[PDB]
Curated annotation (Swiss-Prot), chain A:
N6-methyllysine: modified positions: K16, K78
Modified residues (N6-crotonyllysine): K4
Residues of the full protein shown: 32 to 126 of 126
Name recorded for this polypeptide: Histone H2B type 1-C/E/F/G/I
Post-translational modification remark: Monoubiquitination at Lys-4 (H2BK34Ub) by the MSL1/MSL2 dimer is required for histone H3 'Lys-4' (H3K4me) and 'Lys-79' (H3K79me) methylation and transcription activation at specific gene loci, such as HOXA9 and MEIS1 loci. Similarly, monoubiquitination at Lys-90 (H2BK120Ub) by the RNF20/40 complex gives a specific tag for epigenetic transcriptional activation and is also prerequisite for histone H3 'Lys-4' and 'Lys-79' methylation. It also functions cooperatively with the FACT dimer to stimulate elongation by RNA polymerase II.
Source species, domain of life: Eukaryota
Residues with the N6-acetyllysine modification: K55
GN (gene name): H2BC4
Subunit structure, as described in the record: The nucleosome is a histone octamer containing two molecules each of H2A, H2B, H3 and H4 assembled in one H3-H4 heterotetramer and two H2A-H2B heterodimers. The octamer wraps approximately 147 bp of DNA. Interacts with VRK1; the interaction is mediated by the nucleosome acidic patch, a cluster of negatively charged residues of H2A and H2B forming a cleft within the nucleosome core.
UniProt family annotation: Belongs to the histone H2B family.
Residues found modified as N6-(2-hydroxyisobutyryl)lysine: K4, K13, K16, K27, K55, K78, K86, K90
Entry-annotated residues carrying Phosphothreonine: T85
UniProtKB/Swiss-Prot annotation, chain B:
Residues with PTM Phosphothreonine: T41, T68
Lipid moiety-binding residues (S-palmitoyl cysteine): C71
Residues modified as N6-(2-hydroxyisobutyryl)lysine: K17, K25, K40, K83
Modified sites of kind N6-succinyllysine: K17, K40, K83
Residues of the full protein shown: 41 to 135 of 136
Keyword Lipoprotein appears in the UniProt entry: yes
Biological source species: Homo sapiens
Location of N6-methyllysine modifications: K17, K25, K40, K83
UniProtKB keywords: Acetylation, ADP-ribosylation, Chromosome, Citrullination, DNA-binding, Hydroxylation, Lipoprotein, Methylation, Nucleosome core, Nucleus, Palmitate, Phosphoprotein, Ubl conjugation
Positions carrying N6-lactoyllysine: K17, K40
Protein's name in the database: Histone H3.2
Swiss-Prot record, chain D:
Gene source species: Homo sapiens
GO biological process, one term: telomere organization
Name recorded for this polypeptide: Histone H4
Modified residues (Phosphothreonine): T57
First-to-last residue of the parent protein present: 25 to 103 of 103
Chain positions of cross-link Glycyl lysine isopeptide (Lys-Gly) (interchain with G-Cter in SUMO2): K8, K36, K56, K68
Residue positions, PTM Phosphotyrosine: Y28, Y65
Protein localization: Nucleus; Chromosome
Residues with the N6-(beta-hydroxybutyryl)lysine modification: K8, K54, K68
Curated annotation (Swiss-Prot), chain E:
Chain positions found as N6-glutaryllysine: K84, K88, K107
Range covered out of full length: 13 to 119 of 130
Residue positions where N6-succinyllysine is found in the record: K84
Species annotation: Bos taurus (Bovine)
Modified residues (N5-methylglutamine): Q93
Protein name, UniProt field: Histone H2A type 1
Length: 95, 95, 222, 79, 107, 155
DNA sequence: ACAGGATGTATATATCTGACACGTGCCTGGAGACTAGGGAGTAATCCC
DNA sequence: GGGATTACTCCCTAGTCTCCAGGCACGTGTCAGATATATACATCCTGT
């Protein structure tokens, strides 16, 4: 059958978290999926270029953070770095 | 008979609220295949491909019409003329 | 198949040619001004077997939509039965006064075809008997009070909640039961103190805790 | 001659959505030309992607890639 | 040994392991740190939430309980930062912002 | 609560009488919120009952009427009058109460036939509740005249 | 301008279809435990 | 000052077998909506 992966269930969970009583259309679902894919490619690309610029062969959380600081503008970037730091800290603690 | 300008504004309010495609489907398809027949013989087109082409096309044309309108207003006129389109394209770096 | 199906599939099945249309229940086709009856018109059917419960209400537009739709040569004669619709309104007047004979023998001519009656007497002779018992009732004081409150309502509205079928079918409801018209739910005495109002319903889902929040608005500050 | 398929009231509608009150007569032919060039480039790149994939059917993903490489990313069709 | 997901340990919803796999097999670097997938998943989930929130607001404004592309477009084109983020992005079936110039208004 | 009506009062008396008679009866009514409030009345005065309107799905309709017609003890139905005109079977029912008399006699007699079936064993009596000086007497008269014209034409 | 018959409205039910929604079998990619090569951290130091 | 380079200990991630469950593919149900019926009155449009 060749299963094709997607970010559907995840953006659905997020939707239920922020708006428990709202729905989502299939078109908008695909749009959100393409959105997350695009940003993923952007941040990962910029992180890759960052690693290559400093003669490093490993993309750590630092490269990701700098990439987010370069891509996302202003307060969006601030909250992004905030959530990222919280997540990586909570992951570091809870083994 | 309305004064010449009211129906126009009503149309602007009408189509700025809508999201469905404006250009007819089949003529755009025929145009797509006519332009494509100079790159590859006996081309087969997915419906979603044609729809994507039309979405991007209409989006591009509307975006260009906004800038064109801005060029028209900048010259103290309420009528878009080919000079405005050419100027918009020129500043955008396409001509 | 069924009826909303053939009001959907009418543009298809008009290309299909038929020798036997069999309408089993034309008390679903009981009237004209009927999109179902009109889509039943537009087919090419040599035999249209018409069946129903029975003939029903003696407005006889029912009997029009039977008699003209089923057969030619009465096919437009239901508008001659518009002059017999003058007969149909004096059919109420002869429900008062049964002493006329103008169409009944003509219907005996008509109903030797077009109809075929097997009677209850053929079938109830197997069965036993059924008897209606009529029991009258009254209006209670509150019930008659709301009924002439409705009569005061037609006094104030022929001269709120003024729907005409609020009038007739709420005459019916206040025959039935007065509390369908809105009743107060289980009461209590007034409360003077200061409790704590719940914010919303969609937050405290399942595991909530009640708190004794009862304080008096009268305070004494020391 | 399918470029004339894009009609005058269609271009008018697009201008309305763009927020245009009065439209010149020389606008329509210009619009047909611009659309023709745009479609030329996009479809050229798309067919290139198609031929690289050894396919005779240009898919929607080919259009998405073509638009993405021209700096006009399109959401709602994959990618 | 009672396995648990990396997304649960990071307190996120977006798949950390999937992101890690994509980074590894995405030709981005020879090696990838352990903080990279959780950080990236966190940023993606945050951005997702920020759009879905405003989209839900725009959906509520149109008396609709299902977010459509139009609501997404209205959400992005009003948020200046989100608009800058998706400036070269065309949202399908999203239409445009209702904006009429003052000069074209009736006299 | 729900008593304060004479229709309901005489219904209370006759339901006590038919409990003494030992016969599972019926209801038919036009507006099923009255059927809800009668459900509350009958759950109250402890009568085992079953409900059947258009709101129940078709398999539930046929299965609850099967569960009635297999069980000799559940005492009172609840039915929509007009939606009683299905192909349902009520041989185990033996008495009829119309709480209402609305326009079409053939609907009323049709539900009567749904009781007075071909497989009916005993005399089924039907009680049509009537008020005084009120509009259901008018509808009774009008329907009776329409019944009269119907029966003289197609007798 | 007024009368008459059309269409319109209202309150209450009903049937029947549409476009959603939820529910379940089941594969494969993620998680766990592990070693060890090595990129990276880090102190040291020339010198642009 | 601080960027380049160098010497060097080491923690961190690729690698691999096992394996188990979250998520894909595809299944059954639920109101929403439409269209009816029926009973009067209400009302509007047109003609007389």
């Amino acid at each position: 059958r060749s299963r094709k992966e997607s970010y559907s269930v995840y953006v659905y969970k997020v939707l239920k978290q922020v708006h428990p009583d709202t729905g989502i259309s299939s078109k908008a679902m695909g749009i959100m999926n393409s959105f997350v894919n695009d940003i993923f490619e952007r941040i990962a690309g910029e992180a890759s270029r960052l690693a290559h610029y400093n003669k490093r062969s490993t993309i750590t959380s630092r490269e990701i953070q700098t990439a987010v600081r370069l891509l996302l503008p202003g307060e969006l970037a601030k909250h992004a770095v905030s959530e990222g730091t919280k997540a990586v800290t909570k992951y570091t603690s809870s083994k | 008979r309305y004064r010449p300008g009211t129906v126009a504004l009503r149309e602007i309010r009408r189509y700025q609220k809508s999201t469905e495609l404006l250009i007819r489907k089949l003529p755009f398809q025929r145009l797509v295949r006519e332009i494509a027949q100079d790159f590859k013989t006996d081309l087969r087109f997915q419906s979603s491909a044609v729809m994507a082409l039309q979405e991007a096309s209409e989006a591009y044309l509307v975006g260009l019409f906004e800038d064109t309108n801005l060029c028209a207003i900048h010259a103290k006129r309420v009528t878009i003329m080919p000079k405005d389109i050419q100027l918009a394209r020129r500043i955008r770096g396409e001509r | 198949t069924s009826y909303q199906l053939v009001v959907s599939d009418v543009a298809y099945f008009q290309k299909m040619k038929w020798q036997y249309m069999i309408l089993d229940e034309a008390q679903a086709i009981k009237s004209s001004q009927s999109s179902r009856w009109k889509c039943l018109l537009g087919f090419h059917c040599r035999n249209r077997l018409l069946l129903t419960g029975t003939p029903i209400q003696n407005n006889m537009q029912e009997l029009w939509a039977l008699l003209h739709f089923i057969m030619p040569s009465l096919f437009d004669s239901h508008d001659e039965f518009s002059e017999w619709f003058s007969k149909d309104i004096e059919s109420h007047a002869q429900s008062n006064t049964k002493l006329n004979e103008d169409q009944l023998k003509r219907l005996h001519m008509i109903l030797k075809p077009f109809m075929l009656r097997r009677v209850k007497k053929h079938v109830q002779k197997e069965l036993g008997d059924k008897i209606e018992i009529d029991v009258f009732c009254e209006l209670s004081y509150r019930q008659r009070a709301m009924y002439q409150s409705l009569r005061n309502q037609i006094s104030i509205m022929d001269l709120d909640s003024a729907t005409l079928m609020n009038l007739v079918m709420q005459f019916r409801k206040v025959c039935n039961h007065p509390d369908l018209f809105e009743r107060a739910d289980t009461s209590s005495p007034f409360f003077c103190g200061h409790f704590a109002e719940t914010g919303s319903f969609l937050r405290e889902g399942t595991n909530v805790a009640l708190g004794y929040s009862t304080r008096s608005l009268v305070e004494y500050r020391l | 001659d399918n470029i004339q398929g894009i009609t005058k009231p269609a271009i008018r509608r697009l201008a309305r959505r763009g927020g245009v009150k009065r439209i010149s007569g020389l606008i329509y032919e210009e619009t047909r030309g611009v659309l023709k060039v745009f479609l030329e480039n996009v479809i050229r790149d798309a067919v290139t992607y198609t031929e690289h994939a050894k396919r005779k059917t240009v898919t929607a993903m080919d259009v998405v890639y073509a638009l993405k490489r021209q700096g006009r990313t399109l959401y709602g069709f994959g990618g | 040994a009672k396995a648990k997901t990396r997304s649960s340990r990071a307190g996120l919803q977006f798949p950390v392991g999937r992101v890690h796999r994509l980074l590894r097999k995405g030709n981005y670097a020879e090696r990838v740190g352990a903080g990279a997938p959780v950080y990236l998943a966190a940023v993606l989930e945050y951005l997702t939430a920020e759009i879905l929130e405003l989209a839900g607001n725009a959906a509520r404004d149109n008396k609709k309980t299902r977010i459509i592309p139009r609501h997404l477009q209205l959400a992005i084109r009003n948020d200046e930062e989100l608009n800058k983020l998706l400036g070269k992005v065309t949202i399908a079936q999203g239409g445009v912002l209702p904006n009429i110039q003052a000069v074209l208004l009736p006299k | 609560f729900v008593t304060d009506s004479g229709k309901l009062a005489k219904l209370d008396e006759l339901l006590r009488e038919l409990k003494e008679g030992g016969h599972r009866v019926l209801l038919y009514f036009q507006m099923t919120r009255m059927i809800d409030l009668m459900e509350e009345y009958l759950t109250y005065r402890n009568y085992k009952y079953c409900r059947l309107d258009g709101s129940t799905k078709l398999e539930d309709r046929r299965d609850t009427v099967a569960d009635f017609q297999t069980r000799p003890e559940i005492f009172i139905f609840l039915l929509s009058t007009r939606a009683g005109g299905l192909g349902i079977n009520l041989t185990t029912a033996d008495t009829v109460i119309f709480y209402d008399s609305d326009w079409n006699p053939t609907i009323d007699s049709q539900a009567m036939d749904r009781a007075h079936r071909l497989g009916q064993t005993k005399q089924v009596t039907v009680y049509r509740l009537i008020t005084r000086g009120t509009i259901e007497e008018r509808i009774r008269k009008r329907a009776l005249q329409k019944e009269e014209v119907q029966r003289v034409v197609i007798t």
